[PDB]
Design a protein around this ligand. Structure first.
Ligand code: D27
Ligand code: GSH
Ligand code: GSH
Lengths: 198, 198
């Protein structure tokens, strides 16, 4: 299958798709665009948003929708339909929280104040829920890695850019990040991927 | 299986689960809670959010995660791998918009303002994207009803509460709503369900 992924030059909402392609050893074109080429591309898109994935010429949209499509019938999906539910739920929980950030805010002082308050109150609350949910287990769901573990490592990587000490009291969540980063297809991808802030 | 769904006395985010139970002819306890009891239940839940679905003593969370679990291997799921991706994608597009609403906002004047702007400035574009996407087809995805059709009807119902003229220029989207509402199991639920504003 000929896969082509389109997004900005950043990890952002495309990174989960990139980890999945990497882990499943599926080749694809990692097409990254700059602001200048957005209006042209955007207009051809039914919903006007990226990422999009073209599969043998057919366009797919919605990053989590695409992530799930790529993990279908693989062990990254969750071993049972019940585990798949828990995987989807954790992914949505993380996405709901990531969506609270005013990423696009133009007023820098407002952006700073909002980031600080989300990182001071909400983030440590979520971290406790995540930590107790994982408990002393190896992975977030079941007994093998799922894309929910991937998403966690991805979201936390971005949160750590803004509050480096966020996981200072959560060694089990740090250990989870290290387990994910250590998967060889993931360690490789992380080494060769373009370096960007987000 | 024993199913117990807990949410507020509202269609809201539990409604998609209710339509799915109805269509699949599954009995469940439709548990509805008052606001004053929420803080107490919230504290015992791994992630402090509703709806939750209890199955044989296992808690599930996240409405879409649950909806997806319930429709897996049923005729409400897409017919192909790729069609299931489109079902997921349409649902997420609708969810991304519904999430923008400050449902819980304390300040009335601020809340009204937010709602007005989203409905007046944003909603029209989603409708336009949806209308073009549907085109002249019968259902949003493929040749038969999916839970993406249920979600569209559910989201549109709530939006029409606040902006009744929202679909005046979109007869094909009105037709799809009517078509979902005509499904016997759906029509029966709509007729018998508690009548709430939201
Ligand atoms: C103030 O308490 C309230 C009051 C109303 C609501 C939500 C009502 C509703 O219809 N929501 C939706 C309906 C359809 C699809 C998606 C949503 C969605 O919210 O994502 C929630 C509250 O708790 C936050
Ligand atoms: N939930 C959607 C969000 C899509 C989205 O808002 N993408 C952004 C980039 S992170 C975008 O294209 N927004 C800019 C625009 O619409 O012009 C997804 O994960 O794909
Ligand atoms: N994406 C989640 C959102 C969960 C959510 O925000 N639900 C609301 C009710 S609609 C809630 O539990 N809020 C009450 C609170 O925050 O205390 C889902 O679909 O279930």
């Amino acid at each position: 299958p000929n896969y082509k992924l389109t997004y900005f030059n950043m990890r952002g909402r495309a990174e989960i798709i990139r980890y999945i392609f990497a882990y499943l050893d599926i080749q694809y074109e990692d097409h990254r665009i700059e602001q200048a080429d957005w209006p042209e591309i955007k207009s051809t898109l039914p919903f006007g948003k990226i990422p999009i994935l073209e599969v043998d010429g057919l366009t797919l949209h919605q990053s989590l929708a695409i992530a799930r499509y790529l993990t279908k019938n693989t062990d990254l999906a969750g071993n049972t339909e019940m585990e798949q539910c828990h995987v989807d739920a954790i992914v949505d929980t993380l996405d709901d929280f990531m969506s609270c950030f005013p990423w696009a805010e133009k007023k820098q002082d407002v952006k700073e104040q909002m980031f600080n308050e989300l990182l001071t109150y909400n983030a440590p609350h979520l971290m406790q829920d995540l930590d107790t949910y994982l408990g002393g287990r190896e992975w977030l769901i079941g007994n093998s890695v799922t894309w929910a573990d991937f998403y966690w490592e991805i979201c936390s990587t971005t949160l750590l850019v803004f509050k480096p000490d966020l996981l200072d009291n959560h060694p089990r969540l740090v250990t989870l990040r290290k387990k994910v980063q250590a998967i060889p297809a993931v360690a490789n991808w992380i080494k060769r991927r373009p370096q960007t802030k987000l």
